[PDB]
A paper describes a structure:
Our recent discovery of meditope, a cyclic peptide that binds to a Fab cavity of cetuximab, can serve as an alternative, noncovalent method to modify antibodies, with a precise ratio of two meditopes to one IgG. In this report, we investigate the possibility of increasing the affinity of this interaction by reaching through to the other side of the Fab hole. Our recent efforts to characterize and optimize the affinity of the meditope–Fab complex focused on the importance of cyclization and side-chain modifications. In these structural analyses, we observed that the guanidinium nitrogen (NH2) of arginine in position 8, located in the ‘back’ of the meditope-binding pocket, is partially exposed to the other side of the Fab. We wondered whether it was possible to reach through the other side of the Fab hole by extending the side chain of Arg8, increasing the surface area to improve the affinity of the meditope–Fab interaction.
To test this, we synthesized a series of extensions of Arg8 starting with the addition of aliphatic carbon chains. We wondered whether extending the n-butyl group by four methylene groups, to an n-octyl group, would increase the hydrophobic surface area and result in productive interactions with the Fab.
Residue numbers in the entry:
A (entry chain E): 2 to 11
B (entry chain A): 1 to 212
C (entry chain B): 1 to 220
């Protein structure tokens, strides 16, 4: 699931 | 729309090992597939176009193969700077669609955190709130425990953690734990302690300070 | 070189519209199409649409009615406007250019605009020093930082000494507090012997509230 704070999948 | 399924969701390897990313399409798409790298806070970076065609300025360790429904992005010898998420894209059928991505994680030797503690600034206290910060720097693996204590009272639920993404140069993580209280409670107590548990320590490390 | 620069990140009220400008250079809009892609928690990477060299537009099926793309070739500008945003439209929006004029292999991307759909108000952060001390020193290495507290919406950028300091910098992912405001810390480790000689400043920039703060960080 994509996280807008890090731009990484979390 | 074409469904693109990437597997697995997480890959974990060590530097120098070969690694492969899989992309499966819901129906044949010939060789119409592109591959992207996304780093922390970055935009996607084009690695390979049309299943196997090289892209200018992209390291030779990246290559792609496949046709039909089953495709593979390969790194022949993984480097620490390859820590990212990877996405495939089909464009045989309108509209162009992307898979959900695979996360690349790197293994390394266990590294104990360096622990630092920062009292709230007088500046922040002027506003009626105190933040006490405990920093765990450059450690591996990710799992660690931070336990706060104010005058031997174990704190619970009044702190938040944040963990950086894996470092691109040394593969370690960093963690910050912020304990938040009012100015009044802060002024009511003396000893502020952050106890850190990690695999690379042979016992818990406590950093503390006396207010004033 | 080829570049795509997007307008600053911003808040959008629910049911209201999103406007982003993509300013390009290194190539002419009359020769290449410009595409729009977003990245959300719910649906990952999602192609939204395109404006071609001649001004024709395509919109991905779910957006044919709420999406509008226009451009000014002479000004090298492409304008994106989407209508009636719900909260699941919170995402990163990118403009992109392909390798060849007709194609879809996106070799050049904008930096991306973080778009937050929320009814709340913008709020600038307060910046507090994380002062180096003996409790933050080890082996002649001191740690020091800045606490960037109580802002909305994301993001804030933080640099050190106006970009000249980057090694040993860790800027933590923002965490949402109970108040609905975000917070983060940025730390750096330096030689302790340089604390009496060097200045350390965190440059904090929160565009949505037009808040720029340089915070000097000193041993206490």
């Amino acid at each position: 699931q994509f996280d807008l704070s890090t731009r990484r999948l979390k | 729309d074409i469904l693109l399924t990437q597997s697995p969701v997480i890959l974990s390897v060590s530097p120098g090992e070969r690694v492969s990313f899989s992309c499966r399409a819901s129906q044949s798409i010939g060789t119409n597939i592109h591959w992207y790298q996304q780093r922390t806070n970055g935009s996607p970076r084009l690695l390979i176009k049309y299943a196997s065609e090289s892209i200018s300025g992209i390291p030779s360790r990246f290559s792609g193969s496949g046709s039909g429904t089953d495709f593979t992005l390969s790194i022949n010898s993984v480097e620490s700077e390859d820590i990212a998420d990877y996405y495939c894209q089909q464009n045989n059928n309108w509209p162009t669609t992307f898979g959900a991505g695979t996360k690349l994680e790197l293994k390394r030797t266990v590294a104990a955190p360096s622990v630092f503690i920062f009292p709230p600034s007088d500046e922040q206290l002027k506003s009626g709130t105190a933040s006490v910060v405990c920093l765990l720097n450059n450690f591996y693996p990710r799992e660690a425990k931070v336990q706060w204590k104010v005058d031997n009272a174990l704190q619970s639920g009044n702190s938040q953690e944040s963990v950086t993404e894996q470092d691109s140069k040394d593969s370690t993580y960093s963690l910050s734990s912020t304990l938040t209280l009012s100015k009044a409670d802060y002024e009511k107590h003396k000893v502020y302690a952050c106890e850190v548990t990690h695999q690379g320590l042979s016992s818990p490390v406590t950093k503390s300070f006396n207010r004033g | 070189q080829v570049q795509l620069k997007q307008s600053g990140p911003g808040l959008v009220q629910p049911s209201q519209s999103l406007s982003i400008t993509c300013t390009v250079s290194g190539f002419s809009l009359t020769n290449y199409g410009v595409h729009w892609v977003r990245q959300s928690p719910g649906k990952g990477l999602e192609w939204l649409g395109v404006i071609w060299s001649g001004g024709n537009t395509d919109y991905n099926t779910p957006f044919t009615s709420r999406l509008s793309i226009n451009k000014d070739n002479s000004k090298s500008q492409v304008f994106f406007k989407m209508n009636s945003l719900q909260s699941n439209d919170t995402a990163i929006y990118y403009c992109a250019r392909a390798l060849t004029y007709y194609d879809y292999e996106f070799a050049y991307w904008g930096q991306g605009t973080l778009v937050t759909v929320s009814a709340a108000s913008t709020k600038g952060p307060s910046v507090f020093p994380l002062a180096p001390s003996s409790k933050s020193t080890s082996g002649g290495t001191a740690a020091l930082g800045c606490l960037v507290k109580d802002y909305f919406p994301e993001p804030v950028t933080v640099s050190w000494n106006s970009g000249a300091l980057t090694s040993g910098v860790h800027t933590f992912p923002a965490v949402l507090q109970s108040s609905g405001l975000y917070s983060l810390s940025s730390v750096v480790t330096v030689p302790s012997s340089s604390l009496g000689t060097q200045t350390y400043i965190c440059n904090v920039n929160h565009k949505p509230s037009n808040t720029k703060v340089d915070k000097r960080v000193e041993p206490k």
